[PDB]
Protein backbone atom coordinates (compact mmCIF):
# COMPACT_ATOMS: atom_id res chain seq x y z
CA UNK A 1 0.00 0.00 0.00
CA UNK A 2 3.13 2.46 0.36
CA UNK A 3 4.50 4.07 -2.28
CA UNK A 4 8.41 2.42 -3.82
CA UNK A 5 10.42 5.11 -4.33
CA UNK A 6 13.16 4.28 -6.61
CA UNK A 7 15.96 7.07 -7.66
CA UNK A 8 17.80 7.44 -10.68
CA UNK A 9 20.93 9.59 -12.68
CA UNK A 10 20.14 12.52 -14.09
CA UNK A 11 21.00 11.99 -17.84
CA UNK A 12 22.40 8.36 -18.88
CA UNK A 13 21.03 7.70 -21.85
CA UNK A 14 20.02 5.05 -23.22
CA UNK A 15 19.23 4.27 -19.40
CA UNK A 16 17.74 7.79 -18.09
CA UNK A 17 16.81 10.56 -20.05
CA UNK A 18 14.77 13.15 -20.69
CA UNK A 19 12.83 13.16 -24.41
CA UNK A 20 12.26 16.34 -26.69
CA UNK A 21 9.13 16.69 -24.58
CA UNK A 22 10.78 16.22 -21.25
CA UNK A 23 9.57 13.57 -20.51
CA UNK A 24 11.30 10.51 -18.68
CA UNK A 25 12.53 7.83 -21.01
CA UNK A 26 14.62 4.89 -20.88
CA UNK A 27 16.18 1.34 -20.43
CA UNK A 28 15.81 1.43 -16.76
CA UNK A 29 12.69 3.68 -16.51
CA UNK A 30 10.57 1.50 -19.19
CA UNK A 31 12.20 -1.85 -16.73
CA UNK A 32 11.51 -0.31 -13.21
CA UNK A 33 7.88 0.47 -14.61
CA UNK A 34 7.75 -3.02 -15.75
CA UNK A 35 8.65 -4.92 -12.26
CA UNK A 36 5.91 -2.48 -10.58
CA UNK A 37 3.31 -3.35 -12.94
CA UNK A 38 3.88 -7.11 -12.44
CA UNK A 39 4.28 -6.74 -8.86
CA UNK A 40 1.46 -4.08 -8.15
CA UNK A 41 3.47 -1.41 -6.49
CA UNK A 42 2.70 1.93 -6.22
CA UNK A 43 6.25 3.45 -8.11
CA UNK A 44 7.64 6.85 -7.08
CA UNK A 45 10.40 7.50 -10.01
CA UNK A 46 13.31 10.37 -9.09
CA UNK A 47 16.18 11.62 -11.16
CA UNK A 48 18.18 13.28 -8.99
CA UNK A 49 21.66 12.48 -10.27
CA UNK A 50 24.00 9.21 -9.57
CA UNK A 51 26.41 10.64 -6.90
CA UNK A 52 22.77 11.72 -5.18
CA UNK A 53 21.03 8.80 -5.63
CA UNK A 54 23.60 7.22 -3.64
CA UNK A 55 23.09 9.54 -0.85
CA UNK A 56 19.15 9.58 -0.76
CA UNK A 57 19.30 5.82 -0.50
CA UNK A 58 21.76 5.77 2.31
CA UNK A 59 19.94 8.17 4.06
CA UNK A 60 16.46 5.91 3.38
CA UNK A 61 14.68 8.55 1.46
CA UNK A 62 14.12 6.46 -0.77
CA UNK A 63 14.08 2.76 -1.12
CA UNK A 64 15.89 1.29 -4.14
CA UNK A 65 18.35 2.92 -7.36
CA UNK A 66 17.96 2.09 -11.27
CA UNK A 67 21.05 4.28 -12.82
CA UNK A 68 23.13 1.70 -14.72
CA UNK A 69 24.49 0.67 -11.54
CA UNK A 70 27.75 -2.10 -11.63
CA UNK A 71 27.22 -4.43 -9.37
CA UNK A 72 31.06 -5.32 -7.49
CA UNK A 73 31.95 -6.55 -5.28
CA UNK A 74 33.26 -3.80 -3.13
CA UNK A 75 29.29 -2.04 -3.56
CA UNK A 76 28.26 -5.51 -2.05
CA UNK A 77 29.66 -4.50 1.04
CA UNK A 78 26.68 -1.39 1.15
CA UNK A 79 24.65 -2.42 -0.86
CA UNK A 80 22.38 -5.31 -2.17
CA UNK A 81 21.80 -6.06 -5.73
CA UNK A 82 19.18 -7.89 -8.08
CA UNK A 83 20.29 -10.21 -10.54
CA UNK A 84 21.99 -8.16 -13.37
CA UNK A 85 19.55 -7.08 -16.42
CA UNK A 86 22.66 -5.58 -18.68
CA UNK A 87 26.43 -5.67 -19.86
CA UNK A 88 28.38 -3.39 -18.03
CA UNK A 89 31.81 -2.40 -19.66
CA UNK A 90 33.54 1.18 -19.20
CA UNK A 91 35.93 3.09 -21.82
CA UNK A 92 37.37 6.50 -22.19
CA UNK A 93 35.68 9.33 -23.77
CA UNK A 94 37.15 12.17 -26.17
CA UNK A 95 36.81 14.22 -28.64
CA UNK A 96 36.74 13.29 -31.86
CA UNK A 97 39.80 15.31 -32.48
CA UNK A 98 41.58 14.15 -29.65
CA UNK A 99 44.68 11.57 -30.75
CA UNK A 100 44.95 9.85 -27.45
CA UNK A 101 44.42 6.28 -27.62
CA UNK A 102 45.88 4.30 -25.08
CA UNK A 103 46.05 4.52 -21.26
CA UNK A 104 49.85 5.07 -21.15
CA UNK A 105 49.07 8.57 -23.11
CA UNK A 106 46.94 9.96 -20.26
CA UNK A 107 50.49 10.28 -17.58
CA UNK A 108 50.30 13.82 -16.21
CA UNK A 109 46.51 14.18 -17.53
CA UNK A 110 43.56 14.66 -16.00
CA UNK A 111 40.73 12.11 -16.30
CA UNK A 112 37.14 12.63 -15.50
CA UNK A 113 34.45 10.46 -13.75
CA UNK A 114 31.42 11.18 -12.29
CA UNK A 115 31.20 10.91 -8.05
CA UNK A 116 30.46 7.65 -6.12
CA UNK A 117 30.91 5.58 -9.54
CA UNK A 118 32.92 2.47 -10.65
CA UNK A 119 34.51 4.15 -13.05
CA UNK A 120 36.08 6.95 -10.72
CA UNK A 121 36.55 3.65 -8.75
CA UNK A 122 38.65 2.35 -11.37
CA UNK A 123 40.72 5.45 -11.71
CA UNK A 124 41.29 5.95 -8.23
CA UNK A 125 42.41 1.85 -8.59
CA UNK A 126 44.72 2.35 -11.89
CA UNK A 127 46.06 5.84 -10.88
CA UNK A 128 49.67 4.44 -9.63
CA UNK A 129 49.88 2.62 -12.81
CA UNK A 130 48.66 4.68 -15.53
CA UNK A 131 49.75 8.19 -13.58
CA UNK A 132 47.39 10.35 -14.37
CA UNK A 133 45.06 12.86 -11.83
CA UNK A 134 41.72 12.86 -11.32
CA UNK A 135 38.75 14.92 -11.84
CA UNK A 136 35.13 14.15 -10.40
CA UNK A 137 31.94 15.79 -11.58
CA UNK A 138 28.30 15.32 -10.06
CA UNK A 139 26.80 14.66 -13.45
CA UNK A 140 27.34 13.36 -17.05
CA UNK A 141 26.38 17.18 -18.04
CA UNK A 142 29.00 18.55 -15.56
CA UNK A 143 31.70 15.95 -16.95
CA UNK A 144 30.90 15.86 -20.63
CA UNK A 145 31.04 19.89 -20.46
CA UNK A 146 34.18 19.62 -18.76
CA UNK A 147 35.45 17.14 -21.60
CA UNK A 148 34.61 19.18 -24.41
CA UNK A 149 35.85 22.15 -22.97
CA UNK A 150 38.96 20.27 -23.18
CA UNK A 151 39.43 20.71 -18.90
CA UNK A 152 39.85 17.03 -18.85
CA UNK A 153 41.39 15.07 -21.59
CA UNK A 154 39.19 11.81 -21.09
CA UNK A 155 36.31 11.27 -19.28
CA UNK A 156 35.49 7.47 -18.35
CA UNK A 157 32.21 6.07 -18.26
CA UNK A 158 30.03 3.36 -19.86
CA UNK A 159 30.26 1.97 -23.35
CA UNK A 160 26.60 1.89 -24.51
CA UNK A 161 25.82 5.51 -23.38
CA UNK A 162 28.70 6.74 -25.15
CA UNK A 163 28.28 5.21 -28.25
CA UNK A 164 24.41 6.67 -27.53
CA UNK A 165 25.34 9.80 -27.36
CA UNK A 166 28.14 9.51 -30.24
CA UNK A 167 24.85 8.14 -32.44
CA UNK A 168 23.03 11.52 -31.50
CA UNK A 169 26.06 13.27 -33.19
CA UNK A 170 27.84 14.37 -30.00
CA UNK A 171 31.44 15.37 -30.01
CA UNK A 172 32.90 11.56 -28.42
CA UNK A 173 34.98 9.30 -29.63
CA UNK A 174 36.11 5.91 -28.55
CA UNK A 175 39.73 5.25 -28.89
CA UNK A 176 40.73 2.98 -26.07
CA UNK A 177 40.29 -0.09 -24.99
CA UNK A 178 37.27 -1.38 -23.13
CA UNK A 179 37.27 -2.70 -19.33
CA UNK A 180 34.59 -5.25 -18.59
CA UNK A 181 33.14 -5.13 -15.28
CA UNK A 182 31.32 -8.70 -15.11
CA UNK A 183 29.00 -8.08 -12.22
CA UNK A 184 26.30 -6.03 -14.73
CA UNK A 185 23.88 -3.66 -13.90
CA UNK A 186 21.50 -4.15 -10.72
CA UNK A 187 18.65 -2.91 -8.86
CA UNK A 188 20.16 -1.79 -5.27
CA UNK A 189 18.69 -1.15 -1.69
CA UNK A 190 20.66 -0.62 1.43
CA UNK A 191 22.39 -4.00 2.31
CA UNK A 192 20.10 -6.00 4.71
CA UNK A 193 16.68 -3.63 3.84
CA UNK A 194 13.96 -3.86 0.93
CA UNK A 195 14.61 -7.56 0.26
CA UNK A 196 11.33 -7.75 -0.92
CA UNK A 197 11.65 -5.37 -3.62
CA UNK A 198 15.22 -6.97 -4.50
CA UNK A 199 13.02 -10.59 -5.22
CA UNK A 200 9.92 -8.63 -6.94
CA UNK A 201 12.80 -6.90 -9.24
CA UNK A 202 14.28 -10.17 -9.47
CA UNK A 203 10.95 -12.59 -10.35
CA UNK A 204 9.68 -9.91 -12.69
CA UNK A 205 13.02 -9.62 -14.70
CA UNK A 206 12.94 -13.06 -15.47
CA UNK A 207 9.26 -13.19 -16.64
CA UNK A 208 10.29 -9.71 -18.72
CA UNK A 209 13.17 -11.87 -20.10
CA UNK A 210 11.26 -15.24 -20.55
CA UNK A 211 8.21 -13.87 -22.56
CA UNK A 212 10.23 -11.13 -24.79
CA UNK A 213 9.56 -7.54 -23.31
CA UNK A 214 12.39 -7.10 -21.78
CA UNK A 215 14.00 -7.35 -25.89
CA UNK A 216 10.46 -5.01 -26.61
CA UNK A 217 12.05 -2.55 -24.38
CA UNK A 218 16.07 -2.35 -25.64
CA UNK A 219 14.35 -2.23 -29.27
CA UNK A 220 12.72 1.05 -28.35
CA UNK A 221 16.08 2.62 -28.24
CA UNK A 222 17.43 0.51 -31.11
CA UNK A 223 19.67 -2.28 -28.92
CA UNK A 224 19.33 -5.91 -29.32
CA UNK A 225 21.63 -7.18 -26.33
Do not use: C
Not at 147 to 170: R, W
Request: proline letters at 3%.
Amino acid sequence: ETTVKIASDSSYAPFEFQNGQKKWVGIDVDIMQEVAKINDWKLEMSYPGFDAALQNLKAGQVDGIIAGMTITDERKETFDFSNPYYTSALTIATTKDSKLSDYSDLKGKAVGAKNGTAAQTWLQENQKKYGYTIKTYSDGVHMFAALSSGNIAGAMDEVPVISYAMKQGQDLAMNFPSISLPGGYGFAVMKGKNSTLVDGFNKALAEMKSNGDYDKILKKYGITA
